[PDB]
Amino acid sequence: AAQTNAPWGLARISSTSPGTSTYYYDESAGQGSCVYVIDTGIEASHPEFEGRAQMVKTYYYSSRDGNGHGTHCAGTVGSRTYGVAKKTQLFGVKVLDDNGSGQYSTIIAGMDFVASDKNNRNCPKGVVASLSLGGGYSSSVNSAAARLQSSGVMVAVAAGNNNADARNYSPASEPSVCTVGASDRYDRRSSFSNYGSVLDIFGPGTDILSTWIGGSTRSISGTSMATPHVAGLAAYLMTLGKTTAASACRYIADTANKGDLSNIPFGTVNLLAYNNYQA
Ligand SMILES: [Ca+2]
Ligand SMILES: [Cl-]
């Protein structure tokens, strides 16, 4: 299949060079897989989700997404127009309030919940978790992410928007998970993106068009936007049976476009997520 006039991020993730506008992908579209979006929630009623999204847990007075950050990320995972895995199942875990903030005790609880809840769900192709959040270093938050990954869940986390080494940010600094950096439409490192040895892969994270609350859309930037590209790619590859949750991040790195990115500090991987689709 192909999506003409697709957002640049999707087209980039299916091409070996920048500047294209079509998104080539196998029509399986991650069907059978599940992606947990641990964020500010999801506007499950958005027409772009086609009823494939639903809230499963909130730690606040409502499960409604009053911020839009979570909805934006969920859309890059598998919305009809702006998603990587257009046929995946989306589950929303609300660990951040409508101001995009939340305590580490809540975020940890949210991750333990996904490790157990997946046993109630029908996900024969695998389970993915997308965490577009993070803060200061914390071994407990790192430990929770490692537990989630260990439980058989492909965990993807944002590297942070500090233009610094991700070693001082959690759960980004947890080596056992997949830490995603951000790049712009010209194969340059996003000026805000963090770097470091702990980074595993880069993704489109500058000027990313996706769904927003109110049945609308808008373009924002951040490693929060690059992580869902990788999460959706994982669910996509896992449906095709090319990798597993335990080795997905490694498979994406071995099949990535290498050397295309610029402004990559020495010691940081120069890898760009890529589906390697052939008709
Ligand atoms: Ca890693
Ligand atoms: Cl913990």
UniProtKB/Swiss-Prot annotation:
Enzyme class (EC, first level): hydrolase
Family: Belongs to the peptidase S8 family.
Catalytic residue positions: 39, 69, 224
Ranges of residues in domain Peptidase S8: 7-279
Lineage top rank: taxon: Eukaryota
Span of the entire protein shown here: 106 to 384 of 384
Binding site for Ca(2+) 2: 16, 260
UniProt: Ca(2+) 1 binding residues: 175, 177, 200
Protein name: Proteinase K
Entry cofactors: Ca(2+)
Reaction equation(s) it catalyzes: Hydrolysis of keratin, and of other proteins with subtilisin-like specificity. Hydrolyzes peptide amides
Organism encoding this protein: Parengyodontium album
Keywords on record: Calcium, Disulfide bond, Hydrolase, Metal-binding, Protease, Serine protease, Signal, Zymogen
GO biological process terms held by the UniProt record: proteolysis
Co-factor remark: Binds 2 calcium ions per subunit.
Role summary: Hydrolyzes keratin at aromatic and hydrophobic residues.
Residue pairs linked by disulfide bridges in the UniProt entry: 34-123, 178-249
Assigned EC number: 3.4.21.64
GO cellular component, one term: extracellular region
A molecular function (GO) term: metal ion binding
